[PDB]
Amino acid sequence: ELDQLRQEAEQLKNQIRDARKACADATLSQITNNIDPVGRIQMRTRRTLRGHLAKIYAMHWGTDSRLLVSASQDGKLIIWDSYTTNKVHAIPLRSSWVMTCAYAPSGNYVACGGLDNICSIYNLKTREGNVRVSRELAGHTGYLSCCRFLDDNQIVTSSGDTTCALWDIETGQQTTTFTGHTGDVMSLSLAPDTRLFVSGACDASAKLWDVREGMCRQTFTGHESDINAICFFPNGNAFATGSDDATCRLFDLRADQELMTYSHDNIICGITSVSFSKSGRLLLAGYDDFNCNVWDALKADRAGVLAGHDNRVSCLGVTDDGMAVATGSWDSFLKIWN
């Protein structure tokens, strides 16, 4: 009976509610009252990478922390050399509605995805090193929103069909499908150990997934609207979200409950992309008001603004070595901050 099972779930929600409430004794803000504040941080746009015709949604820093890839609505992929500002490759795409891009951790592959519902795997190091596509992953039945390579042969993709997936590129068929979300999944982040990953969806909830088991290990709630972005802390024991309600929240896997809130009264536009720093002290978030804010992760204070973009900021990334921060926007310009 639906009434019986729904009433059991209603009660079982209460037990988990008290389970999280039991572990809450001291707030993160109260303990971080003694630590030294970060102070006002000023960054400047060192390089500015131009050439895209239409607006941009995605960018992903390389493993060497020098290269990166940019996907734009004009149906183009473009690879950059953030040091010399010179381009490397300009790969035209088949569908002109691309919503995400990725860069392989080995530096060999880049992947895009969008309204075409297809995940395209591009090999950079090839005889031509060009439009020749290595694999066209299909089967999502919904617009693909975010892709992040576990390896050269495994890539996790989140789509609007409310289900995430793990793709064996050689076979081309999704090895494991992650279901449980009720709304469209917008962003996903890989853990550093790459044994777990987290996804935030339109249902205003985040879920922790075991890439090997395939089960929703944990489920985090609290946001009042769609989660547009998500990333892990560098240690792998935490992650932060970016939602449409103009709030960023820090969760904990081990504590299983929300830790910190990153909000300001004079912010009204929803966050589009978030990322963390090398030490995890700084949480950078890209908003719709054309300015990327810089947050002190431990104290929730705001210590800097990267206000240099003409149109909406859509993507955001911090290098693996922590040297630089890239920003893409709807004005079709990439801006490297340092």
Binding site: P92, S95, W97, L115, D116, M186
Partner: protein
């Protein structure tokens, strides 16, 4: 070597930036159109005519008097068009197709929802979207010939489905085509004014609505899109010079 590296990159760069110029002389001369309509609205029949004359995304390309058009149809199962409607803020126009005869019909018995009221509900959400506040909507009232059949005493559907219709009189500026009964005109301009009520209040000087009494078999639908896209561009330039 390292000298040649920058000479290799700048030559690799010079190939990248030249082709991006040629692709900039196509993206600017191309008019991108988004089709938003119900499944049983004749939208697919309209697409068929526009393509032959010249799975989440569907495209097509037709040139009208040396003007490029790129039309995108998005088959969507979710009721929430959001999170993919943002990607169309830069399209030149949205072609909204409505089956006018579909009054008194329900959507596969789903919530016994009237298909006409569903189209009005869909139109209002797209016309009042923050991301599409500058994009104009070319409205197509498609199933006109089927509408005439029911209006002339078919099942005595007097549009009593729409109550305010009894309080309707045809405006004098309405242009009746020859061969059209006065009773048909009372129905057509009631349905059109039902939509024009939505568009008139929401936004002015940012984006307009261009109603048309098309038919699925009509070949003038391509021409109506061309003339409306010409007027949309012209109204944009006149606003740039602050002449409107």
């Amino acid at each position: 070597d390292q000298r040649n590296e920058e000479k290799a990159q700048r030559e690799a760069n010079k190939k990248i930036e030249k082709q991006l110029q040629k692709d900039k002389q196509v993206y600017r001369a191309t008019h991108r159109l988004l089709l938003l309509g119900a499944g049983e609205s004749g939208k697919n029949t309209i697409v068929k005519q526009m393509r032959i004359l010249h799975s989440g995304i569907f495209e097509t390309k037709f040139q009208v008097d040396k003007v490029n058009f790129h039309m995108f149809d998005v088959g969507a199962q979710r009721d929430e068009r959001r999170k993919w409607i943002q990607c169309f803020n830069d399209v030149t126009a949205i072609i909204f197709v409505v089956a006018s005869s579909s009054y008194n019909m329900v959507i596969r018995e789903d919530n016994q929802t009237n298909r006409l009221q569903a189209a009005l509900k869909l139109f209002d959400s797209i016309w009042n979207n923050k991301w599409l506040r500058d994009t104009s909507v070319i409205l197509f009232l498609n199933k006109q010939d089927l509408l005439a059949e029911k209006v002339l005493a078919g099942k005595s559907k007097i549009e009593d489905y729409f109550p305010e219709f009894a309080r309707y009189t045809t405006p004098e500026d309405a242009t009746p085509e020859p061969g059209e009964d006065p009773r048909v005109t009372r129905a057509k301009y009631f349905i059109r004014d039902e939509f024009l009520r939505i568009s008139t209040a929401s936004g002015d000087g940012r984006h307009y609505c261009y109603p048309h009494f098309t038919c699925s078999v009509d070949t003038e639908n391509i021409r109506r899109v061309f003339n409306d896209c010409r007027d949309i561009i012209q109204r944009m330039h006149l606003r740039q010079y602050e002449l409107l």
